[PDB]
Amino acid sequence: ADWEDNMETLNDNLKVIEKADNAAQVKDALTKMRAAALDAQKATPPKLEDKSPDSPEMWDFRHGFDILVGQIDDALKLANEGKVKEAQAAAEQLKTTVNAHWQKYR
Amino acid sequence: ADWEDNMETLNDNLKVIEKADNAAQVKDALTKMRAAALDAQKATPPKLEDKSPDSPEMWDFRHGFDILVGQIDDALKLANEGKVKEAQAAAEQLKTTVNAHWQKYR
């Protein structure tokens, strides 16, 4: 539940989704990502330790993770529709944003 | 806390933000919208009462409100930066998505 471990779970489950061959594996990885993205929004990365809870920086942080959760939800939509290849593509598109957020708040 | 009340809250606070003449008014209305959107996302909307909670339609529902929350976050970012004109503009962009979600799931 600290921010780095949640970012790792996001990062690791991206690789898992790409190597995934079946729908259960993709859905499991997306479910783990959604949980990790919501838990990461409750955590404090180093660049936010000294920032007020209503600071623009905190709101920008929350924005990034709420959008990420929204995108993982849409990937879960596709997966549950039986469009698993589309769901994997949707997830893979998150890699640069996950990595960008990882570095921004490091 | 049902979905209809929360959608009404999103609707009416959009007009509050439109007519606001000070920063606290916009920030509080966005705060009320955020609470309404998150509370509305925990609910089951009328259109989906007959659907599994793991259904693609429910993930699409969750995706829409997660994106909406994400956008409210960014408007609160802007308002707390003291760019209330920009916050108002960002909030106007939600009136479209609020109304579309209300129409889809009512």
Curated annotation (Swiss-Prot), chains A, B:
Q: Which cofactor is essential here? A: heme b
Q: Does the keyword Transport apply?
A: yes
Region Disordered: list its residue ranges: 38-60
One BP term from GO: electron transport chain
Q: What is this protein called?
A: Soluble cytochrome b562
What is the cofactor note? Binds 1 heme b (iron(II)-protoporphyrin IX) group per molecule.
The lineage's top-level taxon is Bacteria
Which parts of the sequence bind heme b?
7, 102
Q: Name one GO cellular component term.
A: periplasmic space
Q: What does this protein do?
A: Electron-transport protein of unknown function.
Keywords, comma-separated and alphabetical: Electron transport, Heme, Iron, Metal-binding, Periplasm, Signal, Transport
- Description of how the protein assembles with itself and partners: Monomer.
For this chain, the family text in UniProt reads:
Belongs to the cytochrome b562 family.
Q: Which GO terms describe its molecular function?
A: electron transfer activity; heme binding; iron ion binding
- Which part of the entire protein is covered? 23 to 128 of 128
Cellular location of this protein?
A: Periplasm
The annotated regions of Basic and acidic residues compositional bias extend over 47-60
